[PDB]
């Protein structure tokens, strides 16, 4: 269900993570001609973004409104196309071309496009349909910002005056805040409009939350990296959040025997440090069928093990989920492997009184970065497997379908839960996946700006917990409630010529505070940081400030430990990311 927008939704975030920050000008047109075919070739990509949010909501956009949202996304096609053609010429054309004629021509093109976005946008926010338009609003907003930054890059070359540029800069700032906050507000509103009580309500809920994460929340997460003044190099970053695929079922209609809403959501992975899949212990049962044929074996329960982010290796293993095994147990080991796909068989037995569905087979496609070669590891119920009915590609497509899927995939499996049906009529398993952009090693690039999310810390102290991020950070954040050391993340430098660095940190504090950075316990950076919220406040874009440390430093260590002081009682610090700016 939905691979049309959910593919364009992952190509755009997968394509935008290269030209994010200050793109080496050659990659900024190597991007924009992918983005003109992904999101702006016709109005076929824009009438799908609508009918996707419509499907998750069971409500309609009227017809006196579903049009003027397409009449504008045509308006914006040309503009954006025409600007990119012009900009591409500008890039190629040797500087013995840059006469006053072509200057004010690209100038007018950029001004056209940017002008038009500013006129269009409220069309994607009309009162009453803000949720249904959300993806359209997002993809547009994202083209508008990504457009606006070009004024900073080429402004002088095109002959815009100091003011002209600086007026664009203030607009990019205000719109980055307004666009982001709009998207979180209305995402949550829609999400809430879908909580219910049945397994049925839940799958719609989760399908909304998955698809909105891929085609909205992942997109806004990159909006502050279009500020090329604050990010004047290329940025190395990652999305740390979870997504759960739809559950694996042998029937469309479970007739109210699916696990209740409360029984799934209150029991899925709560905000946690980042980890990677380590082990799955499959548990198979026997399903006596109506005849000496349909009787089969089904995946009924499991354990899960996951290995924590780098710095620790002492593993985690889950409670038992589901029912214990009546055939022998199967173990697959996933150390060092990245499970870029999952395909599954299901099967059912029709009984005069009831139906019994199960998952009989799951084949796990996987890849290996330590030693470049792809493989498969499979699970077999060992009795009447049936046919494949569930393909994770249909929900987590690849970034691009150019390369083979083990290079161009978009997600790797993180976690496998097993939920029991009502009146043990089966087990429904649920798969959790993370983004391919995550780096196991926590590498600090030597040419680029590096963003290290505090959820990649391997260890938390002084009563520092992991908290639901505010939807625009790309994941969660660390919550400090106490003075003293709060988080410890392991860190991989890429050279050993003493490459000096400056640090910034992206936080939100209720009071003024002091951050201490250390390496292997040696403290190497401290400074005072400004208040940014009042107690009780709900965290919007402006809640988080991004502030530099005074002193350059080298990465002669691996164990970054972050500490907070200044908290009175009832204070909160929220830490999102730590940044590394390579220096001279």
Residues 6+ apart with CB under 8 A from 19: 27, 28, 30, 31, 234
Quick one: 127 and 275 in the same domain?
no
Quick one: 224 and 258 in the same domain?
no
The answer to whether 295 and 384 have CB atoms below 8 angstroms apart is yes
Helix (H, G, I), strand (E, B) or coil at 480: strand
Quick one: 128 and 38 in the same domain?
yes
Q: How many CB atoms lie within 10 A of CB 9?
A: 29
429 vs 302: CA distance, rounded Å? 9
Quick one: 432 and 442 in the same domain?
no
CA of 126: how far to CAs of 103, 130, 211, in Å?
A: 37, 6, 22
473 vs 506: CA distance, rounded Å? 10
Quick one: 58 and 178 in the same domain?
yes
What tokens appear for 540 in the block?
Answer: 């919007």
Quick one: 63 and 172 in the same domain?
yes
CA of 127: how far to CAs of 176, 281, 521, 539, in Å?
A: 21, 50, 54, 24
Quick one: 480 and 554 in the same domain?
yes
Quick one: 315 and 422 in the same domain?
yes
The answer to whether 133 and 68 have CB atoms below 8 angstroms apart is no
Phi, psi dihedrals of residue 498, rounded to the nearest 5°: -50, 85
HEC readout, 252-267: CCCCCCCCCHHHHHCC
Determination approach: X-ray
Residues 6+ apart with CB under 8 A from 405: 340, 341, 365, 393, 398
Q: Which helix (H) or strand (E) holds 48?
A: helix 46-57
Handedness of CA 205, 210, 215, 217 (dihedral sign): positive
Q: Where is the domain boundary, 380, 405, 437?
A: 437
CA of 219: how far to CAs of 14, 164, 433, 544, 557, in Å?
A: 10, 27, 18, 18, 34
487 vs 439: CA distance, rounded Å? 18
The answer to whether 529 and 509 have CB atoms below 8 angstroms apart is yes
The answer to whether 510 and 549 have CB atoms below 8 angstroms apart is no
Residues 6+ apart with CB under 8 A from 101: none
Q: Residue 225 has what DSSP assignment?
A: G
Quick one: 213 and 351 in the same domain?
no
Q: Where is the domain boundary, 207, 229, 251?
A: 229
Helix (H, G, I), strand (E, B) or coil at 182: helix
466 vs 460: CA distance, rounded Å? 9
Q: Where is the domain boundary, 437, 469, 503?
A: 437
The answer to whether 399 and 409 have CB atoms below 8 angstroms apart is yes
**CB-based burial of residue 502 (10 Å sphere; 0-12 exposed, 13-18 middle, 19+ buried)?**
middle
Quick one: 504 and 575 in the same domain?
yes
243 vs 553: CA distance, rounded Å? 37
Residue whose C-alpha is closest to residue 128's, from 201, 219, 205, 190: 190
What tokens appear for 30 in the block?
Answer: 């190597």
Domain, as residue range, for 294: 241-437
Phi, psi dihedrals of residue 89, rounded to the nearest 5°: -55, -50
325 vs 381: CA distance, rounded Å? 11
Torsion from C-alpha of 11, 15, 20, 24, nearest 10 degrees: -170
Quick one: 407 and 554 in the same domain?
no
Quick one: 429 and 392 in the same domain?
yes
Phi, psi dihedrals of residue 343, rounded to the nearest 5°: -125, 135
Structural domain count, the chain:
3
375 vs 38: CA distance, rounded Å? 30
């Amino acid at each position: 269900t939905t691979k049309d927008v959910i593919q364009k939704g992952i190509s755009v975030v997968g394509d935008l993570l290269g030209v994010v920050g200050f793109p080496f000008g050659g990659a900024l047109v190597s991007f924009y001609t992918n983005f003109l075919n992904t999101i702006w070739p016709s109005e076929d990509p824009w009438k799908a973004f609508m009918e996707q949010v419509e499907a998750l909501m069971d409500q309609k956009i009227a017809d006196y409104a579903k049009n003027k949202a397409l009449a504008e996304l045509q308006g914006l096609q040309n503009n954006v196309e025409d600007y990119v053609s012009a900009l591409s010429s500008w890039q190629k054309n040797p500087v013995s071309s840059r006469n006053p004629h072509s200057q004010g021509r690209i100038r007018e093109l950029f001004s056209q496009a940017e002008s038009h976005f500013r006129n269009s946008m409220p069309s994607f926010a009309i009162s009453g349909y803000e949720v249904l338009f959300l993806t359209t609003y997002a993809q547009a907003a994202n083209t508008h910002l990504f457009l606006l930054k070009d004024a900073q890059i080429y402004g002088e070359e095109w002959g815009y005056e100091k003011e002209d540029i600086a007026e664009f800069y203030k607009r990019q700032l205000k719109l980055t805040q307004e666009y982001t906050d709009h998207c979180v507000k209305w995402y949550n509103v829609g999400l809430d409009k879908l909580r219910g009580s049945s397994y049925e309500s839940w799958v719609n809920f989760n399908r909304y939350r998955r698809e909105m994460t891929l085609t909205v929340l992942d997109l806004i997460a990159l909006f502050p990296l279009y500020d090329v003044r604050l990010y004047p190099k290329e940025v190395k970053t990652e999305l740390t959040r979870d997504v759960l695929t739809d559950p694996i079922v042998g029937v469309n209609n479970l007739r109210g025997y699916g696990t209740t809403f409360s029984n799934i959501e209150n029991y899925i992975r709560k905000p946690h440090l980042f980890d990677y899949l380590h082990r799955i212990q499959f548990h198979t049962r026997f399903q006596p069928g109506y005849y000496g044929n349909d009787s089969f074996n089904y995946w009924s329960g499991n354990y899960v093990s996951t290995r924590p982010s780098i710095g620790s290796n002492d593993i985690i293993t889950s409670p038992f989920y589901g029912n214990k095994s009546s055939e022998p147990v199967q173990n697959l080991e996933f150390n060092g492997e990245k499970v870029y796909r999952a395909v599954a068989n299901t099967n059912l037995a029709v009984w005069p009184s009831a139906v019994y569905s199960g998952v009989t087979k799951v084949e796990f496609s996987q890849y290996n970065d330590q030693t470049d070669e792809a493989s498969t590891q499979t699970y077999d119920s060992k009795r009447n497997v049936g046919a494949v009915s569930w393909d994770s590609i249909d929900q987590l497509p690849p970034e691009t379908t150019d390369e083979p899927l083990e290079k161009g995939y978009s997600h790797q499996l993180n976690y496998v839960m097993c939920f029991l049906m009502q009146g043990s009529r089966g087990t429904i398993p649920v798969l959790t996946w993370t983004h391919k952009s995550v780096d196991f090693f926590n590498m600090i690039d030597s040419k680029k700006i590096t963003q290290l999310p505090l959820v990649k810390a391997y260890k938390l102290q002084s009563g520092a917990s992991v908290v639901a991020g505010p939807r625009f950070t790309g994941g969660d954040i660390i919550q400090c409630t106490e003075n003293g050391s709060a988080a410890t993340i392991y860190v991989t430098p890429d050279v050993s010529y003493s490459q000096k660095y400056r640090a910034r940190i992206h936080y939100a504090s209720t009071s003024q505070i002091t951050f201490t950075l250390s390496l292997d316990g040696a403290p190497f950076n401290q400074y005072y940081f400004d208040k940014t919220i009042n107690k009780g406040d709900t965290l919007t874009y402006n809640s988080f400030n991004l502030a530099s440390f005074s002193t350059p430093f080298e990465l002669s260590g691996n164990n970054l430990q972050i500490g907070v002081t200044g908290l009175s009682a009832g204070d909160k610090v929220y830490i999102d990311k730590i940044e590394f700016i390579p220096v001279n």
